[PDB]
Symmetry: C2
Subunit: 37 residues, 2 copies
């Protein structure tokens, strides 16, 4: 059960800070940081 929603609840499982790091990683990885960074 690896649904998109299932992932949502994952982000709502950790702290905001922990999510900042996650998103930050993707930002650099996928190099898609062009939206009010």
């Amino acid at each position: 059960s690896i649904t998109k929603d299932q992932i949502i609840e994952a982000v709502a499982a950790m702290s905001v800070m922990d999510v900042v790091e996650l998103i930050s990683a993707m930002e650099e990885k996928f190099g898609v940081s062009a939206a009010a960074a």
Copy 2:
């Protein structure tokens, strides 16, 4: 091994579209909409 990094490769494992829906999901859920943010 539910590490942040492990999740990174997860977002790079799915299709762009699937990722679009995801991002869009959280966007609404967490309502993190700050004028194109």
